[PDB]
Amino acid sequence: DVSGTVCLSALPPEATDTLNLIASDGPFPYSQDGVVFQNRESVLPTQSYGYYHEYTTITPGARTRGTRRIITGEATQEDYYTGDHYATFSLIDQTC
Helix, strand or coil, X not given: CCCCEEEXXXXXXXXXXXXXXXXXXXXXXCCCCCCECCCCCCCCCCCCCCCEEEEECCCCCCCCCCCCEEEEECCCCCEEEECCCCCCCEEEXXXX
């Protein structure tokens, strides 16, 4: 289940960076950014394979990809933010 919606302005600034890169189709900091997100645990709504894709939201100071990500849905303006490594997701509202 999705844990509600959240304004983009309320998320870490890096989330905005991630969305800006997605808007230009990259290039991304990680060649892996853009791979399909399987939604294996069915936390997000059920969709066919390839409907979701994941991108890294950089965590300052981290040597690894960290726990923050933005998962895109193919629908218009459909983007999910997770800050706990895919445990929970919140729909991102870019209008606020």
